[PDB]
Design a binder for this molecule. Structure first.
Ligand code: HEM
Ligand code: HEM
Lengths: 145, 145
């Protein structure tokens, strides 16, 4: 029910996503890496999916981790840019879901990214209001998994 | 090697990439789909790799094709944004190469995107000078396959 989940992205939710992304997306390498290292720190078990990245404890210094982290932020950039057209938002979200389904990543597992997002947002002084908005965007992806 | 190929992106090459992307990257959906449809038209042999997308001739109306096309443009956006730092450019290029290697896409196969890029650029009054600059960026990826 991707379209149904997209319906939860109301005018106010879209506004908070764009306002917070204006800051978070301004440093894709820095915030992308912070997002990943926080995920690994708070949910060590997720590291099992990233054996290809090697020594993730290296953080920013790990070229593969950095490459993945920056690339992840462009997926979010893609989503933010499509917010005003649900037909396009839905097709790019389903595109993203394809490889995650193949990796056998469930909606519950994918949702573990909510904690890291909440923390990265707070480090930039974006409170619960914004974290909730982001959880709603993540929920659109969860609906496709 | 990808490191030697990245070093081929000289000052003027980087500038021409930015100037042309300024225009082509303004309409990621339209130019992204144009890019893909041109690939399938001039190189029908490549269609086999995109079985999941379905009836590719539907163009913009094919949701999966549209989703793929928009997403492809954000990878180019990624590359353009990393031109300032060779180390970052290389790590995002190698990241992109991973799934293409898995699909057994060779450097020669990947290089078939040069024709479509040249044609999309030309439609926007960007000549050979620009097509050649983009061929050099594509060569960085080819070096990682
Ligand atoms: C905001 C959430 C997320 C976004 C936007 C996102 C985005 C992406 C993108 C764009 C890629 C590269 C293209 C691809 O191979 O599909 C990727 C790869 C991947 N993602 Fe996700 N992802 C997210 C969360 C997660 C989570 C929570 C997990 C697992 C617990 C996960 C596991 C993976 C894995 C294993 C890869 C491959 C990494 C590699 O070997 O390079 N992703 N993701
Ligand atoms: C400028 C050149 C290109 C760029 C930037 C690019 C980018 C991408 C991106 C971002 C994805 C989605 C993430 C992933 O699954 O890895 C993708 C998927 C894919 N690419 Fe590439 N690509 C390019 C050229 C090509 C070429 C020339 C071929 C084959 C002849 C190819 C075949 C594929 C296939 C089959 C998929 C999966 C499609 C699907 O099932 O949704 N790509 N590419």
């Amino acid at each position: 029910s991707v379209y149904d989940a997209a319906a939860q992205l109301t005018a106010d939710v879209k506004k908070d996503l764009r306002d917070s992304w204006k800051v978070i997306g301004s440093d894709k390498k820095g915030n992308g890496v912070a997002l990943m290292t926080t995920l690994f720190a708070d949910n060590q078990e997720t590291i099992g999916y990233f054996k290809r990245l090697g020594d993730v404890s290296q953080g920013m210094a790990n070229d593969k981790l950095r490459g993945h982290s920056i690339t992840l932020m462009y997926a979010l950039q893609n989503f933010i840019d499509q917010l005003d057209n649900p037909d396009d938002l839905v097709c790019v979200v389903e595109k993203l879901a394809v490889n995650h389904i193949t990796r056998k990543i469930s909606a519950a597992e994918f949702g573990k990214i909510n904690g890291p997002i909440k923390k990265v947002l707070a480090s930039k002084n974006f409170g619960d209001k914004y974290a909730n908005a982001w959880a709603k965007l993540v929920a659109v992806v969860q609906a496709a998994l």
